[PDB]
Amino acid sequence: YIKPTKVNKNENGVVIDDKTVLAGSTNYYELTWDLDQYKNDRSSADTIQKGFYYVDDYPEEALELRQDLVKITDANGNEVTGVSVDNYTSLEAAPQEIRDVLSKAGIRPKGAFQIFRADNPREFYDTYVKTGIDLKIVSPMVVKKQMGQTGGSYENQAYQIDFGNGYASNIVINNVPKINPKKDVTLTLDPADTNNVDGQTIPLNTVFNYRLIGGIIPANHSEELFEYNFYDDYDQTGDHYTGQYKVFAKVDIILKNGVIIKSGTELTQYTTAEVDTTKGAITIKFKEAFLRSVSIDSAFQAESYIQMKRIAVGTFENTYINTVNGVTYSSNTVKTTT
Ligand SMILES: [Ca+2]
Ligand SMILES: [Ca+2]
């Protein structure tokens, strides 16, 4: 059976079809150009001249192209030359040549799409088609930051067009988690206590905590965590950072080696803090090697407690930024009175 096939992979070449993919992650889409049914073909010149194209109809509202990382290899491992790639923002913008090929093949891409085109049909034919050598196209596409603000699902589909005939690939679907960091104000540490004093008043010179709750990274995700930070530029005219902070697991976490770390476990040992005393700021950073030791199948979430002393009267606000794999996500803003 002639079948162009499409599979999504992470940067380590693991298959990630149906996995949760974080904003900022790359989909290393691998497109198969299925030519193995044409072995020994001996078509006319007119027929060969109808050309060979491949189409990827990618979801442009969710993903951005990484053009430069596009690679085409033949089944014998030779890199493929003679195939050029063009990205079109809409059908309306494609040349007539392209609109006609697509129309006569019964292919109508939704929104934006890529075309891979054999520059010389005769030569492409003689090289890969009459010999039935399948090609592999890798066309990496990054999930836009915005998908991480809204959550959502996206799908990708390809077509191959041989002698002007179109064949559709399977459709690959993934989804993106809405990362929503939260910020509470608490009077005690101890994660079990759900008390939140956002809005209330704090007596002058009270030692308290800002509770910085990280975004939830769901199980079955597509790549390794390498960064998970809590950045807090607090108002030092109101709040004095006391130099004390702790970090806790907020869901059960499973490592690559099978070791489990229960929700509530203190994770401070796997962190450092970058402190900027003049600016009045602190960044709590998970060590990259710890994050990377976590299984891609595991859920992951953590929360930091920074200990503050209220040192003046007035109304003071605070906000923090949770940075996950290079993408920033802001929390709500708390406000207390003194
Ligand atoms: Ca599209
Ligand atoms: Ca500050």
Residue numbers in the entry: 1152 to 1489
What did the original publication write about this model?
SpaP is a 1500-residue adhesin expressed on the surface of the caries-implicated bacterium Streptococcus mutans. SpaP is a member of the antigen I/II (AgI/II) family of proteins that are expressed on the surfaces of oral streptococci and are key molecules for networking with other microorganisms and host cells in the oral biofilm. The structure of AgI/II proteins is unique in the sense that the proline-rich region and the alanine-rich region wrap around each other, forming an elongated fibrillar structure that presents the variable domain at the tip. The structure further consists of a C-terminal domain which contains an LPXTG motif that anchors the protein to the cell wall.
The structure of the C-terminal domain of SpaP (residues 1136–1489) was solved and refined to 2.2 Å resolution with six molecules in the asymmetric unit. The final model of SpaP-C1136–1489 from S. mutans consists of six independent protein chains, each binding to two Ca2+ ions. The crystallized protein consists of two domains, C2 and C3, each of which adopts a β-sandwich fold. In each β-­sandwich the two sheets are linked by a covalent isopeptide bond formed between the side chains of a lysine and an asparagine. In the C2 β-sandwich an isopeptide bond is formed between Lys1157 of one sheet and Asn1307 of the other. Similarly, an iso­peptide bond is formed between Lys1334 and Asn1469 of the C3 β-­sandwich. The Ca2+ ions are likely to play important structural roles since they are located in close proximity to the isopeptide bond in each domain. The Ca2+ ion in the C2 domain is coordinated by carboxylate groups from two residues, Asp1208 and Glu1211, the carbonyl O atoms of Lys1261, Tyr1209 and Ala1263 and one water molecule. In C3 the Ca2+ ion is coordinated by side-chain O atoms from Glu1387 and Asp1384, the main-chain O atoms of Lys1430, Gly1431 and Tyr1385 and one water molecule. The overall structure of S. mutans SpaP-C is generally very similar to the structure of S. gordonii SspB-C, with the isopeptide bonds and Ca2+ atoms in identical positions.
